[PDB]
């Protein structure tokens with residue numbers, strides 16, 4: 001674990017607020033003093049008191065993975081505290097929290113270009129993740145964090161693996177026989193793209209799991225979010241191709257969004273499951 005995660009000294013960490021509760025213990029905010037004396041805001045995940053040895057391994061397991069990525073669109077690990085208690089994972093602070101809950105508070109309040117900027121960041125981070133040989137397997141708006149400048153970053157590597165499961169975000173073939181590839185992450189990205197353009201609407205609403213699985217398999221797809229640019233809806237559909245080999249690669253997705261960011265006059269054509 002200390003291969004990719006530097007041990008931090010607890011005296012350099014101030015805790016200034018309990019901000020949430022994770023799968024493993026509280027999540028807080030605070031500050032970290034770096035060796036250069038610079039002070040930065042950080043998110044701090046704590047491991048619950050009474051943790052079993054297993055929980056400790058899983059908890060720090062996420063840090064070992066996170067510590068492998070250094071990219072502007074992947075949550076940055078600052079380090080871990082293990083030589084004292086509570087055990088902690090320290091990451092950069094994202095002032096605007098989870099992307100889905102953020103967008104829900106701002107229904108229709110952003111411009112197409114702003115939403116596309118968010119989406120470009122996510123794709124860029126996923127491009128790097130897939131470049132590194134990892135499948136995320138849990139790519140969803142709730143696992144994207146957004147900072148004070150609207151920069152979006154991939155997080156939560158709990159289910160991530162080198163090359164249970166959230167049914168709504170998982171590709172047909174991964175649901176069918178656990179075929180997880182980068183192309184199954186591209187499927188998830190398509191769902192994320194839908195979440196963004198829908199400002200945090202839940203994928204497939206409250207349909208039963210059984211029906212989500214069946215409908216998608218039969219070729220049904222989420223419908224165009226209100227006022228969704230045709231270009232972006234078609235990108236969802238491309239991400240949701242039945243043949244995984246026909247989905248774009250994250251590199252192509254980045255390229256597509258980069259173009260849309262340029263001529264927003266592309267975005268002027270505007271568009272129950274669709275067959």
Ligand SMILES: CCCCn1c(-c2c(C)ccc3[nH]ncc23)cn2c3c(=O)[nH]c(=O)n(C)c3nc12
Pocket residue numbers: 019020022027042043044045062066075089090091092093094095096097098142143144145155156157
């Ligand atoms: C996907 C989010 C899981 C919990 N987590 C982590 C985090 C931490 C601290 C350690 C490992 C992690 N893996 N993935 C995230 C993560 C950092 N943050 C923040 C945050 O920085 N700002 C905020 O406003 N909120 C709400 C935050 N919530 C978290």
